[PDB]
Structures are given as structure tokens and as C-alpha cells.
Amino acid sequence: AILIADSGSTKTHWNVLDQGRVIGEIFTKGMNPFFQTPEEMGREIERTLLPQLNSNRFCEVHFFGAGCIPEKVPVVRNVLKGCLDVSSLIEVDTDMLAAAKASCGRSPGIVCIMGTGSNSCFYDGEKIAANVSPLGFILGDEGSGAVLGKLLIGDLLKNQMGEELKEKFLRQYELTPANIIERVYRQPFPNRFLAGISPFLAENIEHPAIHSLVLNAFKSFLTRNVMQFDYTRYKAHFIGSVAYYYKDILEEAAAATGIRTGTIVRNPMEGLRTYYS
Amino acid sequence: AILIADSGSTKTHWNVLDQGRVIGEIFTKGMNPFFQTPEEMGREIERTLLPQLNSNRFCEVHFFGAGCIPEKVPVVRNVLKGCLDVSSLIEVDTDMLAAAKASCGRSPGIVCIMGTGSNSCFYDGEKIAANVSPLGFILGDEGSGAVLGKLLIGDLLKNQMGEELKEKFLRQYELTPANIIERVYRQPFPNRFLAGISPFLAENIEHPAIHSLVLNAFKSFLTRNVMQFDYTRYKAHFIGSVAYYYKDILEEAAAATGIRTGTIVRNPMEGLRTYYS
Ligand SMILES: CC(=O)N[C@@H]1[C@@H](O[C@H](C)C(=O)O)[C@H](O)[C@@H](CO)O[C@H]1O
Ligand SMILES: CC(=O)N[C@@H]1[C@@H](O[C@H](C)C(=O)O)[C@H](O)[C@@H](CO)O[C@H]1O
């Protein structure tokens, strides 16, 4: 009856709710209209949800995803229309609203996302009131795996952390200098590439230089994004993968810059299903 | 009868030298194999110079251009071979060697490029011995117009330099945030876009925040790139447009980083032309 989604830049999880229960859970690759034309978006969409759904018809469909700026929301909604059957109108918004509906539900509060990309907001109870548009992983997205990987590759190959870690990194993923620039500048979804090579940071987090890179990235995010809200009486609900597995470094950078924190979960799906019933 | 060129990712100049003089000069847009396949680069080459190029059949031909790393040198080298007719063997290199031959000729010294992109090297007298390969404007290129433009836009729309400069920037180039993000993530040659909006820094240099942003970008460049060379007895020949019109901030950052300075040219061609005959 209802279909729920949350499209990250690298992956997408889909949920099917009927009479308030979960009758199906789906995974797909990431969809961002700034990395995917509607053909790629849609032909992928053909290959995705439809095969694992006995019935392709619904009454309500709610799709939240990265790159879903208002200028691109109708584009993505028409992509989903040419593949689904819903009795009412399709809602299409950003992943921030999914995170907010998941964390706070019908109540207000601050919500931030740290995964493939980064983002920060204040939320009313039914809609996002304010938002720092993150500009992406080239002009912002500070503190997220794609940016972490961007920083790490840059620092390593500028000989800023020595040869040992540089060689362990380039050997662990069997990459030459050419692979990076080809993968980042000429190959689809370079943010996936960066966010995927970024867990090397977690692997060698005991090194001060790597721990400091992660900490200073978290610092810059909080400074340039979360500080723009009333962070002195609001418990920032953090959602995302980077924020979950780097919990300690995030709490480090938060106590440094005075940013407050509340509940920190990795995926909004279980909080989203609670909201819809 | 020889032709020498130097194509930055934004522009390209071609020269045909006979009788010790320059007998003809044509200009075309920039070609970079990481934002243009070599055919597309090439499909313009038909449109620009050849229609006017009286003879495409001459002796030696030597082409230097950005993004033209060893992994990419042969592809571009055959593209010029399958239309062009040159009597001797093909030279293919990066813009750094043109800058070095122009700046240093047959003598050594440190040579740096500051325009659309960044790069760093020490040069012997026939070829570059050491180099910090800049990885481009997404993983490095610190101190370059695209990176300067990247930083300024990022800071502005995250409200890090106020509303006055942010608004003056967005109305003066008649850009909205979505247009920005569309131009950087979906539009060809985003490095030109950033480097073209970057002169806003020089225009508003009286603001402390912008002067410090430009200076600190220059600082880290010297730090992460030039410091990797012998900067204590070598007078760094800086080459480029950014380096000429931001001369004072560069000398500031040079006294800041103890780094020495030499010659500042924006374009190398007559020094390149001086080298050949
Ligand atoms: C241009 C781009 O990719 N933005 C995305 C965001 O998308 C919304 C629509 C936005 O741009 O504001 C997304 O919420 C965050 C977290 O996933 O990462 C950013 O990179
Ligand atoms: C990935 C990329 O585009 N790098 C280019 C450089 O190209 C060389 C070959 C290199 O990549 O090492 C170029 O020298 C400088 C200055 O123009 O700008 C960078 O952006």
C-alpha cells in the first residue's frame, strides 16, 4: 500500500509498509540526479524495486534522496511515475526530511546527516524549517566519507603522512596514481570511490595524523554547518554511517566546538517506519 | 618548420616557427583529457586551427598540455598524429615543462604554475626531475584559480564571510545556488567555472576574510607542494595569471613561509619562442 525509500548517494534502501507492518525490505544502488540522468536513474529503477515486489501498485509513495533539490524534485518524481502505480500524488523530497521524520517524528529539533555526504538542519515536526545547503562533496559535505576520502588521498599523495601509510593505502586497494584521477575525474560516481577508500582512516585511526584529519574534518563540518543554528538548547539528532562508526571522534569535535548532541543512529529506516503508521 | 603549443585546461595557443620568426599564431579552447575525451578535444581541433592552417604537413611537432600524464600521453599523441603530418618524432608533455623551458631554458631552478590549476617542480635543463603532481582541482591543485574559486563559493553560501559579499557575488555573476551546483557537477569543464568566478577575490581584496582566504590557500600550496623541494637556495620561478595579479599576496605568503621567489610571468610563449630556433 505504501512504499518508503531513502536514497543515499551510494545506496538506497526501500521499505514496503502495509497496514502498519513491514512486508518487504529492498536495497538498491545510490541515486542522485546530479550523478544520474533520468535514463540511468530510471533504467536502474527498472532493474531494482520492480523485480522484488509481487505487486507494483500502491496508494502512497514517499521517496527521499540526495540531490533532490526543488529544481530536480519534479524530474525525479516523473522518473518514479514511469515505473510505479500510486493512487495519490508521489512525494519527493531530500534525505534530510527523512532523517528528521525518523529522528524526531512529529516533534521539532535539529537533525544532521553524516554518511556519503553531509548536511544539517532544523526541523519543525512536519517539515524542515532551515537548512545549510551542503553544496556537495566538492564545495562542502564536510565530515562525510566522500570528503574524508578526498582529504586522505590528497594528504597521502602530497607526502603529508609519509610513505608507509601511502603505500599501505595504494597497495590495499591496488591503485596507482592514474586509477585515482581516472576514477575521480572520468569515472561515474567518484563520491562512491572516495567514500569507499575512506575506511582506511578508521583502519589506522590510532595514528595522530589520521585521527587529526578525521577530527578536523568533523570540526569544519560543525563550524560551517551546525553552528548556524541554535545549538545551545537543541540536542542535535545525528543520522548517518560516518557519524555512527566515528562516534568518539565526533563527540571529540563536538565538545571542542560546543556543539550539542542527542541520539546518534546510523540508518533512519527504523525511525521512518515508526513515523508512518 | 616546427609547431609548439601549450594548452591549459581553459585555453590553447599554437605557434608555427620558420626563419627564426613567428609566422602565424592561432588560439583555441583548452583541452584536458579528464573533462574531454581526446576525440571531442579533437573534434574542436578540426573546427579551430586546421581550416586556417595553410599546411598541416611540416616537420617536428611538440605539444605540452595539462592532464597529459604518462598514462594519458600516448592517446593524445596519436590524436594529433592521425590528422597532423610531422616529419620527426612527437614530444608530448605537461604545461610544467613548457613553463620550465620558458623560465629556465637550459638552466635549472624551481618553477611553479598558478592559473586554472596548480603544480610544482624543480627543473634541470632538459626535463623535470622532481614534481608534486597536483591531482587536480578536487584532490589538490591548492592555490589555483579553480581551488580559489572552490573555496570562495563554499565559504560564501555557508555564510562564512557574511551576506554582503555572498550576495554581491551571486548577483554580479547572476548565479543561484542550484546553477552553481549544476555547473560544477553536471556541466563540462567545471574547473573553468570555478577559476572564472575566482577573480571576485582580487575584486574584493580589501575585506580581511577574503585576503586571508587567498593567503592561506597560497600558504598550504607552498606548504604541501613547494616545500617538498629545495626552497633554501632556489629562487622559485612562479608562472601564471593568478600569480601575477596576486603578486603581493604571494610575496606575503612567501615571507610567511620563508619560501624564495623569482620570475613571475603569466604566459611563457616568447620565452618558449626564445628557446626554439
Ligand atoms: C548536490 C548534492 O549532492 N547534495 C547532497 C544533499 O542533497 C540535498 C538535496 C542537497 O543538495 O541539499 C544530501 O542531502 C547530502 C546528504 O546525503 O549530501 C549532499 O551532497
Ligand atoms: C588532474 C589534473 O588535471 N592536473 C592538472 C595538471 O596536469 C598535470 C599533467 C597533472 O595532472 O599532474 C596541471 O599541470 C595543473 C596546471 O595546469 O592543473 C592540474 O589541474
The 3-class SS string of chain B reads: CEEEEEECCCEEEEEEEECCEEEEEEEEECCCCCCCCHHHHHHHHHHCCCCCCCCCEECCEEEEECCCCCCCHHHHHHHHHCCCEECCCCEEECHHHHHHHHHHCCCCEEEEEECCCEEEEEECCCCEEEEECCCCCCCCCCCCHHHHHHHHHHHHHCCCCCHHHHHHHHHHCCCCHHHHHHHHHCCCCHHHHHHHHCCHHHHCCCCHHHHHHHHHHHHHHHHHCHHHCCCCCCCCEEECHHHHHCHHHHHHHHHHHCCCCCCEECCCHHHHHHHCC
Distance of residue B250 Cα from the nearest chain A Cα, in angstroms = 21
For residue B188, give Cα distances in angstroms to A41, B25, B97: 20, 27, 26
The partner residues of B5 in beta bridges, in order of sequence, read B14, B63
Phi-psi region of B67 (alpha: psi -120 to 50; beta: other; left: phi over 0): left
The correct CATH number of B2-100+269-275 out of 3.30.420.40, 2.120.10.30, 3.50.50.60, 1.10.10.10 is 3.30.420.40
Q: Which three cell numbers stand for residue A200?
A: 582506511
Of all helices (H) and strands (E), which one includes residue A101? Answer: helix A95-103
Q: How far apart are CA A8 and CA A188, in angstroms?
A: 15
Element (H, E) at A23: strand A21-29
Nearest partner of B154 among A224, A170, A88, A22, judged by Cα = A224
Pairing of strands A237-239, A264-265: parallel
Resolution value (Å, 1 decimal): 2.7
Give the H/E segment covering residue A5.
strand A2-7
> In whole angstroms, what is the distance from residue A42 CA to residue A45 CA?
5
Ligand 2 lined by B99 (C-beta under 6 Å): no
Report the distance separating Cα B213 and Cα B149, nearest Å.
11
Q: Is the separation of the CB atoms in B101 and B94 below 8 Å?
A: no
Compute CA distances A82 → A40, A42, A86, A130, whole Å. Answer: 13, 8, 11, 32
Question: Cell triple for residue A251?
Answer: 563527540
> Do A179 and B72 touch, CB atoms closer than 8 A?
no
**Cell numbers describing residue B133:** 603532481
One-letter amino acid of A276 = Y
Non-local CB neighbours of A164 within 8 Å, separated by 6+ positions: none
CA gap B226, B212 in Å, rounded: 20
β-pair type (A21-29, B57-58): unpaired
Please give the Cα distance from B236 to B215 (Å, whole number). 17
Number of neighbours of residue B134 by Cβ within 10 angstroms: 27
Contacts by A246-253 with C-beta closer than 8 Å and gap 24+? A246/A202, A246/A214, A246/A218, A249/A205, A249/A211, A249/A214, A249/A215, A249/A218, A250/A114, A250/A218, A252/A215, A252/A218, A253/A215, A253/A216, A253/A218, A253/A219, A253/A222
Q: What angle do CA B36, A183, A64 make, to 5 degrees?
A: 100
Q: What's the rounded Cα separation, in Å, for the pair A139 and A75?
A: 24
Q: Contact, B97 vs B66, CB < 8 A?
A: no
Report whether A201 contacts A210 (CB < 8 A). yes
Q: Are strands B57-58 and B85-86 parallel, antiparallel or unpaired?
A: parallel
> A255-266: buried (b, 16+ CB within 10 Å) or exposed (e) per residue?
eebebebeebbb
Q: How far is the CA of B237 from the centre of ligand 1 (A)?
A: 41
Q: CA angle A32-A35-A37, nearest 5°?
A: 90
Chain centre distance of CA B19: 29
Entry field: residues in chain A: 277
B240 alpha carbon, closest ligand: 2
Integer Cα distance of A7 and A28 in angstroms: 8
Q: Residues of A with CB below 8 A from B139's CB? A: 150, 153-154, 157, 180-181, 184
Largest distance between two CA atoms of chain B: 59
- Which of A73, A121, A138 should be substituted to probe chain B, the one whose Cβ sees the most B Cβ atoms within 10 Å? A138
How many residues are recorded in chain B?
Answer: 277
Q: How far apart are CA A252 and CA A139, in angstroms?
A: 24
Q: Which helix (H) or strand (E) holds A184?
A: helix A177-185
In the chain, the amino acid numbered A44 is E
CA distance A30 to A271: 20
A9 lines ligand 1 (CB under 6 A): yes
> Which neighbouring-strand residues pair with B41?
none
Rounded Cα gap, residues B81 and B38, in angstroms: 12
Chain A interface, best mutation among B69, B131, B139, B148, by max A CB count within 10 A:
B139
The rounded distance, in Å, linking the Cα atoms of B236 and B241 is 16
Please give the Cα distance from A168 to B274 (Å, whole number). 46
* Cα–Cα distance, B95 to B78 (Å, whole number): 19
- How does DSSP classify residue A131? E
Of B150, B182, B224, the CB nearest to A160: B224
**How much distance in Å is there from the Cα of A9 to the middle of ligand 1?**
8
* B232 touches A at CB < 8 Å: no
Q: Whose CA is nearest to atom 10 of ligand 2?
A: B67
Query: B-chain residues within 8 Å CB-CB of A140?
Result: 154, 158
Name residues whose C-beta falls within 8 Å of residue B243's C-beta, 6 or more positions apart in sequence: B112, B114, B115, B250, B264, B266
Q: Quick check: CB of B177 below 6 Å from ligand 1?
A: no
Ligand 1 binding pocket mutation candidate from A63, A97, A141 (most atoms within 8 A of CB): A141
A153 touches B at CB < 8 Å: yes
Kindly report the three-state secondary structure assignment for every residue of A202-251: HHCCCCHHHHHHHHHHHHHHHHHCHHHCCCCCCCCEEECHHHHHCHHHHH
Q: Using DSSP, state whether A1 is helix, strand or coil.
A: coil
Contacts of B205 (CB under 8 A, 6+ apart): B211, B214, B249
DSSP character string of A29-90: E---TTT--HHHHHHHHHHHTGGG-S--EESEEEEEBTT--TTTHHHHHHHHHTT-EESSPP
Q: Are strands B2-7 and B61-65 parallel, antiparallel or unpaired?
A: parallel
Amino acid at B78: N
Method by which the coordinates were obtained: X-ray
User: Which chain A residue has the Cα nearest residue B139?
Assistant: A154
